[PDB]
């Protein structure tokens, strides 16, 4: 659930949606290529000399440290703009993840193609340590293929790693609408944006800047128990069982659900309706043997 104007303006709800949903570089990359591009002054890719020269015709980094192997990634406009993501941020994330060991340069947004250029920067001392130039693993092109495989899937640009998808909608049903008491004292239902997720990360989401921390909740009871504790999971377990039982319009008297949820929670931890719960109580061995594990219990 969202606070403030982000609960009414769809664009702000979408902004929070982008702040939650996990986006890796693969979700925003159209293609990748590896080139032998040994002189940035005369790039073997023709379509980009006009910007590449502008980076090298200034002193901030030294072509003598440049590895001749180029990693070239092409992004696509729709996935970038659906996320309000910029190549300045992508480069910042790259340099945050790899430091100064990896050099990245990128083009103007005026282009019909979004491109950034990556290569290993060899700021070593030029020792004659020439036995394969490294003591065992790889040459630079195979290494750069490994760097690509890593960057595509293990570099996070936005969101929370476990939140695989987010949906936003207006709730048609009053059980998800915000209810207020008016100054006249009537109940009123407000239709406000909510986000539903695939995947769970309750503690991170509660701490987001416009998330309503009072109402936001998981359906995973072990997450509730970890973040909010035993009385929270006592209330959530009742809610979830009620939802399952009442989905078809059936009704069960509250005291039965209450007694099951209390049985599941009176020991201070989530006790499963399974041998791993029931047969770990202080109940005597003859009671345990009537359920499961009969001979091992005895």
């Amino acid at each position: 659930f969202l606070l403030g104007q982000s609960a009414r303006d769809a664009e702000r709800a979408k902004d929070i949606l982008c702040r939650l949903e996990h986006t890796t570089l693969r979700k925003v990359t159209a293609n990748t290529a590896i080139y032998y591009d040994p002189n940035p002054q005369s790039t073997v890719v023709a379509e980009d000399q006009e910007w590449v020269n502008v980076y090298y015709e200034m002193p901030d980094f030294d072509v003598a440290r440049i590895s001749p192997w180029l990693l070239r990634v092409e992004l696509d406009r729709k996935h970038m703009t659906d996320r309000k993501l910029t190549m300045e941020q992508i480069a910042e994330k790259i340099n945050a993840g790899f430091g100064d060991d990896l050099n990245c340069i990128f083009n103007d947004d005026n282009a019909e193609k979004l491109v950034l250029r990556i290569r290993i920067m060899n700021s070593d001392e030029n020792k004659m340590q020439e036995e394969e130039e490294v003591v065992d693993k790889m040459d630079d092109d195979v290494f750069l293929r490994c760097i690509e495989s890593n960057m595509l899937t293990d570099m996070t640009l936005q969101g929370i790693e476990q939140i695989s998808k987010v949906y936003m909608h207006l709730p048609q049903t009053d059980n998800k609408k915000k209810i207020i008491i008016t100054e006249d004292g009537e109940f009123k239902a407000l239709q406000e944006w909510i986000l539903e997720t695939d995947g769970v990360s309750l503690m991170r989401v509660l701490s987001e800047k416009d998330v309503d921390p009072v109402r936001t909740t998981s359906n995973d009871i072990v997450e509730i128990f970890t973040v909010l504790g035993i009385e929270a999971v006592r209330k959530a377990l009742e809610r979830e069982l009620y939802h399952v039982i009442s989905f078809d319009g059936s009704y069960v008297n509250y005291r039965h659900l209450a007694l099951l949820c209390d049985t599941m929670t009176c020991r201070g931890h989530l006790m499963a309706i399974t041998r791993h719960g029931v047969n770990r109580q202080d109940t005597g061995p003859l009671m345990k043997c009537s359920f499961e594990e009969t001979v091992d219990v005895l």
């Binding site: 195979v142 293929r145 490994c146 495989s149």
Partner: protein
């Protein structure tokens, strides 16, 4: 699930699988060999030594670079083995008993590749071209599946199934019973030839084996050896 056209042996199953720089490597689960073999080693053991000659069995149009990129990790993996004798040794090191001499390991590998791998394609010598083409077709089918160009097979589709009727069901029993009868005829006669004298075969043939094997299995419906009823 390969079966020879005449049921001289039961079916033998070959699996060619694609494993879940990192790349998609293809391996073969051959029968009587303890470990999965890189397919390119299986092709070299069948005597196709150069990478081009191998890919000519797997990729029928070379102007299709998406398949080439997908076989390439397997050409990389096997590049350390480059001669047929090294490949047959590699295969024979596995499955064969560790101590046997090089000639016996090579011979074991050739025996598996002739008689146990794809027996429906042939069990003769000089069948290696037929076997290389069918194993190449198996890899090609796997590539088409991995590229999404051909749909995965349905185990429910009744074209992929067969109904064993009374005849085949009885033939399954009678093979094993006739084998047990020949076994007992050898066991009976050997303790006469060990005693230097000819034997009456009318006494060697214990006709109870067939008569009671078929009777028992039809009586109980346990379709197998009575000793193995569970």
């Amino acid at each position: 699930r390969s079966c020879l056209e005449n049921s001289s042996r039961p079916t033998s199953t070959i699996w060619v699988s694609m494993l879940a720089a990192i790349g998609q490597r293809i391996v073969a689960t051959l029968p009587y060999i303890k470990q999965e073999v890189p397919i390119i080693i299986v092709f070299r053991a069948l005597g196709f030594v150069s990478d081009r000659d191998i890919l000519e069995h797997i990729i029928y149009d070379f102007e299709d670079p998406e398949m080439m990129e997908m076989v390439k990790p397997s050409l990389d993996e096997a590049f350390v083995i480059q001669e047929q004798n090294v490949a047959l040794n590699f295969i024979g090191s596995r499955g064969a008993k560790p101590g046997v001499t090089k000639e016996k390991r090579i011979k074991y590998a050739k025996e598996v590749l002739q008689k146990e791998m794809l027996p429906h394609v042939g069990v003769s010598d000089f069948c290696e071209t037929k076997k290389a083409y069918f194993l190449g077709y198996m890899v090609h089918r796997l590539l088409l599946a991995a590229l999404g160009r051909r749909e995965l097979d349905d185990r429910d589709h009744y074209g992929n199934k067969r109904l064993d009727l009374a005849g085949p069901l009885l033939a399954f029993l009678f093979r094993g019973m006739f084998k047990n009868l020949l076994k007992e005829v050898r066991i009976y006669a050997q303790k006469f030839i060990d005693r230097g004298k000819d034997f009456n075969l009318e006494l060697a043939i214990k006709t109870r084996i067939i008569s009671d094997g078929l009777k028992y299995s039809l009586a109980t419906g346990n379709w197998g050896d009575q000793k193995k009823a569970h």
